[PDB]
Each structure stands twice: as structure tokens, then as C-alpha cells.
Scaffold this active site. Structure first.
Site, PDB file in Angstrom:
ATOM      1  N   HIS A  22       0.827  -1.197   0.000  1.00  0.00           N
ATOM      2  CA  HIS A  22       0.000   0.000   0.000  1.00  0.00           C
ATOM      3  C   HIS A  22       0.865   1.251   0.000  1.00  0.00           C
ATOM      4  O   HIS A  22       1.377   1.698   1.023  1.00  0.00           O
ATOM      5  CB  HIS A  22      -0.946  -0.037   1.209  1.00  0.00           C
ATOM      6  CG  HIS A  22      -1.922  -1.169   1.087  1.00  0.00           C
ATOM      7  ND1 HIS A  22      -1.834  -2.344   1.793  1.00  0.00           N
ATOM      8  CD2 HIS A  22      -3.012  -1.301   0.301  1.00  0.00           C
ATOM      9  CE1 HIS A  22      -2.831  -3.148   1.463  1.00  0.00           C
ATOM     10  NE2 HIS A  22      -3.570  -2.535   0.553  1.00  0.00           N
ATOM     11  N   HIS A  29      -4.871  -6.145  -5.665  1.00  0.00           N
ATOM     12  CA  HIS A  29      -4.722  -7.191  -4.655  1.00  0.00           C
ATOM     13  C   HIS A  29      -6.062  -7.527  -4.008  1.00  0.00           C
ATOM     14  O   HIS A  29      -7.020  -6.760  -4.110  1.00  0.00           O
ATOM     15  CB  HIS A  29      -3.713  -6.793  -3.582  1.00  0.00           C
ATOM     16  CG  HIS A  29      -4.073  -5.599  -2.756  1.00  0.00           C
ATOM     17  ND1 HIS A  29      -3.787  -4.308  -3.147  1.00  0.00           N
ATOM     18  CD2 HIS A  29      -4.694  -5.494  -1.555  1.00  0.00           C
ATOM     19  CE1 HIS A  29      -4.213  -3.463  -2.226  1.00  0.00           C
ATOM     20  NE2 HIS A  29      -4.769  -4.154  -1.247  1.00  0.00           N
ATOM     21  N   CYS A  64     -12.892  -3.915   7.397  1.00  0.00           N
ATOM     22  CA  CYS A  64     -12.266  -4.196   6.113  1.00  0.00           C
ATOM     23  C   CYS A  64     -10.958  -4.928   6.340  1.00  0.00           C
ATOM     24  O   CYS A  64     -10.372  -4.844   7.423  1.00  0.00           O
ATOM     25  CB  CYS A  64     -12.031  -2.894   5.337  1.00  0.00           C
ATOM     26  SG  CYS A  64     -13.509  -1.851   5.207  1.00  0.00           S
ATOM     27  N   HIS A  66      -7.550  -7.751   4.575  1.00  0.00           N
ATOM     28  CA  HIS A  66      -6.917  -8.464   3.474  1.00  0.00           C
ATOM     29  C   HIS A  66      -6.806  -9.952   3.774  1.00  0.00           C
ATOM     30  O   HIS A  66      -6.191 -10.362   4.763  1.00  0.00           O
ATOM     31  CB  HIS A  66      -5.527  -7.892   3.200  1.00  0.00           C
ATOM     32  CG  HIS A  66      -5.508  -6.437   2.849  1.00  0.00           C
ATOM     33  ND1 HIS A  66      -5.399  -5.446   3.794  1.00  0.00           N
ATOM     34  CD2 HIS A  66      -5.574  -5.798   1.660  1.00  0.00           C
ATOM     35  CE1 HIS A  66      -5.401  -4.265   3.203  1.00  0.00           C
ATOM     36  NE2 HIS A  66      -5.508  -4.444   1.900  1.00  0.00           N
ATOM     37  N   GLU A  84      -9.850  -6.772  15.185  1.00  0.00           N
ATOM     38  CA  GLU A  84     -10.109  -5.339  15.224  1.00  0.00           C
ATOM     39  C   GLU A  84     -11.179  -4.998  16.247  1.00  0.00           C
ATOM     40  O   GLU A  84     -11.169  -3.915  16.829  1.00  0.00           O
ATOM     41  CB  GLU A  84     -10.545  -4.835  13.848  1.00  0.00           C
ATOM     42  CG  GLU A  84      -9.506  -5.001  12.754  1.00  0.00           C
ATOM     43  CD  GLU A  84      -9.827  -4.267  11.471  1.00  0.00           C
ATOM     44  OE1 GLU A  84     -10.850  -3.549  11.396  1.00  0.00           O
ATOM     45  OE2 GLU A  84      -9.046  -4.402  10.505  1.00  0.00           O
ATOM     46  N   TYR A 101     -12.359  -1.611  -6.422  1.00  0.00           N
ATOM     47  CA  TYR A 101     -12.265  -0.147  -6.336  1.00  0.00           C
ATOM     48  C   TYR A 101     -10.825   0.337  -6.248  1.00  0.00           C
ATOM     49  O   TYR A 101      -9.962  -0.253  -5.591  1.00  0.00           O
ATOM     50  CB  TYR A 101     -13.097   0.347  -5.150  1.00  0.00           C
ATOM     51  CG  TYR A 101     -12.317   0.693  -3.906  1.00  0.00           C
ATOM     52  CD1 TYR A 101     -11.951   2.009  -3.639  1.00  0.00           C
ATOM     53  CD2 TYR A 101     -11.935  -0.275  -2.984  1.00  0.00           C
ATOM     54  CE1 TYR A 101     -11.237   2.343  -2.506  1.00  0.00           C
ATOM     55  CE2 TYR A 101     -11.219   0.044  -1.842  1.00  0.00           C
ATOM     56  CZ  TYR A 101     -10.875   1.358  -1.614  1.00  0.00           C
ATOM     57  OH  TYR A 101     -10.166   1.706  -0.487  1.00  0.00           O
ATOM     58  N   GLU A 111      -5.327   2.689  -2.416  1.00  0.00           N
ATOM     59  CA  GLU A 111      -5.902   1.351  -2.326  1.00  0.00           C
ATOM     60  C   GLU A 111      -6.321   0.955  -3.747  1.00  0.00           C
ATOM     61  O   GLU A 111      -6.739   1.833  -4.505  1.00  0.00           O
ATOM     62  CB  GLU A 111      -7.093   1.243  -1.390  1.00  0.00           C
ATOM     63  CG  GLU A 111      -6.782   0.763   0.015  1.00  0.00           C
ATOM     64  CD  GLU A 111      -6.227  -0.638   0.105  1.00  0.00           C
ATOM     65  OE1 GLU A 111      -6.100  -1.186   1.225  1.00  0.00           O
ATOM     66  OE2 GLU A 111      -5.883  -1.239  -0.939  1.00  0.00           O
ATOM     67  N   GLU A 113      -8.190  -2.557  -5.171  1.00  0.00           N
ATOM     68  CA  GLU A 113      -8.638  -3.830  -4.654  1.00  0.00           C
ATOM     69  C   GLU A 113      -9.800  -4.459  -5.411  1.00  0.00           C
ATOM     70  O   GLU A 113     -10.645  -3.749  -5.945  1.00  0.00           O
ATOM     71  CB  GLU A 113      -9.079  -3.649  -3.185  1.00  0.00           C
ATOM     72  CG  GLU A 113      -7.973  -3.116  -2.287  1.00  0.00           C
ATOM     73  CD  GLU A 113      -8.367  -2.957  -0.837  1.00  0.00           C
ATOM     74  OE1 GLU A 113      -9.437  -2.374  -0.555  1.00  0.00           O
ATOM     75  OE2 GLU A 113      -7.581  -3.401   0.034  1.00  0.00           O
ATOM     76  N   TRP A 158     -15.139   4.008  -0.037  1.00  0.00           N
ATOM     77  CA  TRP A 158     -15.669   2.664  -0.292  1.00  0.00           C
ATOM     78  C   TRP A 158     -16.986   2.446   0.452  1.00  0.00           C
ATOM     79  O   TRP A 158     -17.890   1.807  -0.102  1.00  0.00           O
ATOM     80  CB  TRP A 158     -14.658   1.584   0.055  1.00  0.00           C
ATOM     81  CG  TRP A 158     -14.244   1.529   1.489  1.00  0.00           C
ATOM     82  CD1 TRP A 158     -14.860   0.842   2.495  1.00  0.00           C
ATOM     83  CD2 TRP A 158     -13.114   2.191   2.076  1.00  0.00           C
ATOM     84  NE1 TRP A 158     -14.179   1.039   3.674  1.00  0.00           N
ATOM     85  CE2 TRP A 158     -13.108   1.859   3.447  1.00  0.00           C
ATOM     86  CE3 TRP A 158     -12.115   3.028   1.568  1.00  0.00           C
ATOM     87  CZ2 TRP A 158     -12.139   2.335   4.328  1.00  0.00           C
ATOM     88  CZ3 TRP A 158     -11.154   3.500   2.442  1.00  0.00           C
ATOM     89  CH2 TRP A 158     -11.176   3.152   3.800  1.00  0.00           C
TER      90      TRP A 158
HETATM   91  C1  LIG Z   1      -9.313  -0.134   3.014  1.00  0.00           C
HETATM   92  C2  LIG Z   1     -10.132  -1.268   2.414  1.00  0.00           C
HETATM   93  C3  LIG Z   1     -11.210  -0.895   1.549  1.00  0.00           C
HETATM   94  O1  LIG Z   1     -12.099  -2.257   1.671  1.00  0.00           O
HETATM   95  C4  LIG Z   1      -9.807  -2.599   2.721  1.00  0.00           C
HETATM   96  C5  LIG Z   1      -8.605  -2.717   3.667  1.00  0.00           C
HETATM   97  O2  LIG Z   1      -9.007  -2.578   5.040  1.00  0.00           O
HETATM   98  P1  LIG Z   1      -7.819  -2.227   5.926  1.00  0.00           P
HETATM   99  O3  LIG Z   1      -8.415  -2.198   7.307  1.00  0.00           O
HETATM  100  O4  LIG Z   1      -7.234  -1.069   5.586  1.00  0.00           O
HETATM  101  O5  LIG Z   1      -6.910  -3.455   5.923  1.00  0.00           O
HETATM  102  P2  LIG Z   1      -6.158  -4.034   7.111  1.00  0.00           P
HETATM  103  O6  LIG Z   1      -7.095  -4.406   8.235  1.00  0.00           O
HETATM  104  O7  LIG Z   1      -5.407  -5.101   6.762  1.00  0.00           O
HETATM  105  O8  LIG Z   1      -5.259  -2.987   7.702  1.00  0.00           O
HETATM  106 MG   LIG Z   2      -9.175  -3.358   8.799  1.00  0.00          MG
HETATM  107 MN   LIG Z   3      -5.263  -3.071   0.325  1.00  0.00          MN
END
Ligand SMILES: CC(CO)CCOP(=O)(O)OP(=O)(O)O
Ligand SMILES: [Mg+2]
Ligand SMILES: [Mn+2]
Ligand SMILES: CC(CO)CCOP(=O)(O)OP(=O)(O)O
Ligand SMILES: [Mg+2]
Ligand SMILES: [Mn+2]
EC number: 5.3.3.2
Lengths: 180, 176
Positions: A22, A29, A64, A66, A84, A101, A111, A113, A158
Site C-alpha cells: 500500500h 490485490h 475491512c 486483506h 479489530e 475499487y 488502495e 482492490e 468505499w
Molecule cells: C481499506 C479497504 C477498503 O475495503 C480494505 C482494507 O481494510 P484495511 O483495514 O485497511 O486493511 P487491514 O485491516 O489489513 O489494515
Molecule cells: Mg481493517
Molecule cells: Mn489493500
């Protein structure tokens, strides 16, 4: 942690260290987005922590993340909700499997994705992780949908794109029913 | 810069350096809020920079600040308008002179203020100080009120309080 890189068609080609990935020129991804509702049918809205690399301090939908190597999109949802938010959930439902997006954040982090969207019910109390989430609120969807329409710039892009998808939105609506 | 400490009545009793004054235990002090509209009647909404001590990265009204000793409220607004947004304005006008509030931000930083509210129109272009503003948006008051009414949690608590005060909303609804 890493991300799963994809090509033109959504086909995986390998992985990449999450941080490193990122940047101002993020490659495509795999990701997910989930909208979580309590028994009462309220939607959990969250506020990204100031330490998040992308969209820090921004109000957004519940969670959100990955998916990692080996993991299913739905397992990722369950994992992330726990990490989280400390929360247990019902099996995530797919409500927008084709969402994809690309977008740049206030400091120019990108981002980019393939981001299927899910909804689920929480089945436990919250244990907010404040390395990931700095604030939260339980709301009525209709209010949240009214906020996004009146001032869409106050929320993650998003969150807005997914909520105005007519088909994802009706699935959200079905989750506002009270479930004992 | 400093803040002005106020007793039970709003009588100044001393000062504190501004950074050192905002804590989990902030004591009552003097401040202003200001809603800036442009020639076309759009409301300017801003997003506080991530470095602000209180409510960083939060969406709020146009400009907020702390008058110094012997400085008029009107001068403070003009001063912070120049300072945070590089913008010139018309004489600030009163919209909510007796607003006062105490609140706590998600990291636990408190604002505790006598905070009279003003309104004005910009007379020049913005030039942003990214030490103070990280984002901003020119928009119609009515949508902003709609958003404040629907999702108040997405905006600063004093913005929400001010715009939900009947008299204040009336006067804000006139600058357009
Ligand atoms: C930012 C997006 C938009 O769906 C997805 C990623 O969510 P993040 O919370 O940013 O990802 P991660 O929890 O891995 O830090
Ligand atoms: Mg997250
Ligand atoms: Mn990402
Ligand atoms: C006055 C309020 C509530 O309107 C918050 C304080 O204004 P700040 O903008 O935080 O003060 P300053 O710009 O001086 O840092
Ligand atoms: Mg200010
Ligand atoms: Mn203050």
C-alpha cells in the site's frame, strides 16, 4: 502480513508484504469489506485509527481487511472482526461479490482492490482494538444511508460506493430485522 | 499563544500556553466558533489536520479558535481565518453568543469552553495551512444540516450542538 496480488482478470499471481504494498502506486490485490449488525438490527459504524496508513481518522463501515495466503475470504472476515473488534459473528453473507475499487487517500496512499462485500450478525460483545479502531457507533441503517447521501465526503469512499449499490443495499436492509 | 482561563462566571483569571491547556482534564476557557460562507452562499466545512491536539481528523465547521487576552472575538476569528485558511472575511456576526460546552475526544482529550459562535463571508480565495486543515468541502448548508441530523457522530460535537440550536440554525440559514 501480506496481500494477494491479482491481474486484469481477478487472478492471483503472488503475495506482497502488506505495508510495502500500500503506497502511492499500489498494485491490484485481494481484500474484503464487511457490514456488521447487532441482534437488534443496528449497524456497527467504525472510525479508523489515526495510526492506519490509509484513511486514518475516517468513519467507515464495520470492518475491512486483506485475506492472507491459504485463507478464505470469509475466514478473513471472521479473523479481522476478532482482531479489530474482538467480536464473534454469524456466517458472513456475500452481498456484493463483484465490488472492485481504486482510490487515493488524503495523503496520497492508494488502495486498489478486488473487494467482495459481506454482511453478518454479531453474536458477542465488542472488545475494540484501539490500534485499529478509534471510535464506533451503533446506528440505524436508514440514518447512516441518510448521512451518506447528504454529505458523502464525510465518510470513506468505499463505504459510500458499497452502500449505494442497490443490491448490496437491500441486503444491508434485510439485516436490520431484530433477531433473537 | 495561550487560552484564557475563566471562573464560574466568564471572568478571566489567568492564562495557559495553548498546547499545555488541552488535556484529559481541560479547565474552562475562552474560545470561538465560526461558520464561513462564500459569495454564492456555500458553507465551508473543514477537516482538522491529524496533528491537532483535540479532535484530529474530525469534520467540523469552518474555523475555531482561542481569543488572546484583550483580543476581540471578532479579531480572533479574522486572525484564525487568515492563519488556518489564508482567507479574508467580512465582519464576523453573532449567531450563538452564549454557547458553552465540555466534551471528550476519542483519545480522551477534552474541550471545555465558553465558545460564542459567529458567521461571515469570505472575500478572497482559500490558501490552506495543512498544519491546521487536512481536507475541506464547499457545500450547501441544507445538506450539511441533513448530515448533522442523520449522523451527528460523523461531525465534531460542538458543530453538532451549534447547528442543532434552533436560534443558531435560523441565523445560519440566512447567510445563503
Ligand atoms: C481499506 C479497504 C477498503 O475495503 C480494505 C482494507 O481494510 P484495511 O483495514 O485497511 O486493511 P487491514 O485491516 O489489513 O489494515
Ligand atoms: Mg481493517
Ligand atoms: Mn489493500
Ligand atoms: C473552539 C473549539 C470548539 O469550536 C475547539 C478549539 O478550536 P481549535 O481550532 O482547536 O483551536 P486552535 O485553532 O487554536 O488550535
Ligand atoms: Mg482552529
Ligand atoms: Mn480550547
Amino acid at each position: 502480513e501480506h496481500v494477494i496480488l491479482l491481474n486484469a482478470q481477478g487472478v492471483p499471481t503472488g503475495t506482497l508484504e502488506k505495508y510495502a504494498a500500500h503506497t502511492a502506486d499500489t498494485r491490484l490485490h485481494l481484500a474484503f469489506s464487511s457490514w456488521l449488525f447487532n441482534a437488534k438490527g443496528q449497524l456497527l459504524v467504525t472510525r479508523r485509527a489515526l495510526s492506519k496508513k490509509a484513511w486514518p481518522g475516517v468513519w467507515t463501515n464495520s470492518v475491512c481487511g486483506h485475506p492472507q495466503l491459504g485463507e478464505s475470504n470469509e475466514d478473513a472476515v471472521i479473523r479481522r472482526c476478532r482482531y479489530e473488534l474482538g467480536v464473534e459473528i454469524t456466517p458472513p453473507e456475500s452481498i456484493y461479490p463483484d465490488f472492485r475499487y481504486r482510490a487515493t487517500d488524503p495523503s496520497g496512499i492508494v488502495e486498489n482492490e478486488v473487494c467482495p462485500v459481506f454482511a453478518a450478525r454479531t453474536t458477542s460483545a465488542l472488545q475494540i482494538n484501539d490500534d485499529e479502531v478509534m471510535d464506533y457507533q451503533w446506528c440505524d441503517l436508514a440514518d447512516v444511508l441518510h448521512g451518506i447521501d447528504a454529505t458523502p465526503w464525510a465518510f470513506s469512499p468505499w463505504m459510500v460506493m458499497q452502500a449505494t449499490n442497490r443490491e448490496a443495499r437491500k441486503r444491508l436492509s434485510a439485516f436490520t430485522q431484530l433477531k433473537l
